[PDB]
Amino acid sequence: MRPFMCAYPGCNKRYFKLSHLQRHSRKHTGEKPYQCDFKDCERRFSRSDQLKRHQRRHTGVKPFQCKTCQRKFSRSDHLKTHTRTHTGEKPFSCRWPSCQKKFARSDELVRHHNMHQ
DNA sequence: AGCGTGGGAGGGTTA
DNA sequence: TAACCCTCCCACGC
Ligand SMILES: [Zn+2]
Ligand SMILES: [Zn+2]
Ligand SMILES: [Zn+2]
Ligand SMILES: [Zn+2]
């Protein structure tokens, strides 16, 4: 399954790719060489992709646009869940007894599940 | 309730 | 040999 296993004592985390393991290894070492050099910000990241995603907050760039209402979004995963507001898709159904409510996002189902109990 | 929108994280592809 | 792009998990706020 996962041939790349973390060698840190007690971690026991395994990965499919070596790049995934080397990316995880910075969690133990704590190195965050990708600092944000914008003013009034001290955010640091161990990954370059997380820094550039964060720096969209400073630049205001929204590269992902909804083809229905033309609204732009900073992140592609948030455009995907926004599209369900137009299509009405709710792929996450509550499995509580007698309940039939469905939700477009998983965190909405988790919040609804916590309301049952 | 429904949904915008961050960080943290793991999947993938690519010279 | 990591940068790059993707969605998910979890969280916070209105
Ligand atoms: Zn580890
Ligand atoms: Zn910043
Ligand atoms: Zn839209
Ligand atoms: Zn329910």
Side-chain angles (χ1 to χ4, degrees), chain A residues 2-66 68-114 116:
Chain A
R2 305 168 176 266
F4 298 96
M5 190 173 186
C6 184
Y8 193 85
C11 184
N12 302 325
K13 280 184 174 298
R14 306 166 61 94
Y15 297 92
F16 297 103
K17 304 291 193 304
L18 179 59
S19 61
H20 300 167
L21 174 58
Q22 294 178 331
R23 190 170 56 185
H24 159 65
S25 63
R26 297 191 170 181
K27 187 69 175 184
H28 305 294
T29 66
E31 51 194 303
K32 296 183 178 181
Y34 288 101
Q35 85 282 352
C36 183
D37 286 326
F38 280 92
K39 288 171 179 171
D40 196 359
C41 183
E42 305 82 44
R43 282 287 184 176
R44 304 187 64 91
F45 301 91
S46 63
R47 299 164 49 166
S48 65
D49 55 1
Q50 292 178 344
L51 174 59
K52 291 179 180 58
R53 183 186 64 176
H54 157 81
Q55 288 187 142
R56 299 172 189 170
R57 301 172 57 184
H58 303 289
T59 62
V61 180
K62 300 181 179 180
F64 311 98
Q65 185 183 30
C66 173
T68 300
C69 69
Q70 283 66 45
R71 185 171 181 173
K72 302 179 180 180
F73 300 89
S74 63
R75 288 166 48 161
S76 59
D77 55 318
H78 291 340
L79 173 60
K80 175 180 179 61
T81 55
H82 162 78
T83 306
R84 303 202 173 106
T85 70
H86 302 293
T87 67
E89 183 190 16
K90 299 180 180 181
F92 310 105
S93 304
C94 181
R95 298 303 169 180
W96 194 273
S98 74
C99 193
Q100 296 175 289
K101 283 190 173 60
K102 303 180 298 181
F103 303 94
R105 303 213 310 252
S106 286
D107 58 311
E108 303 186 39
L109 174 58
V110 176
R111 188 179 62 181
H112 169 75
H113 177 72
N114 297 330
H116 277 288

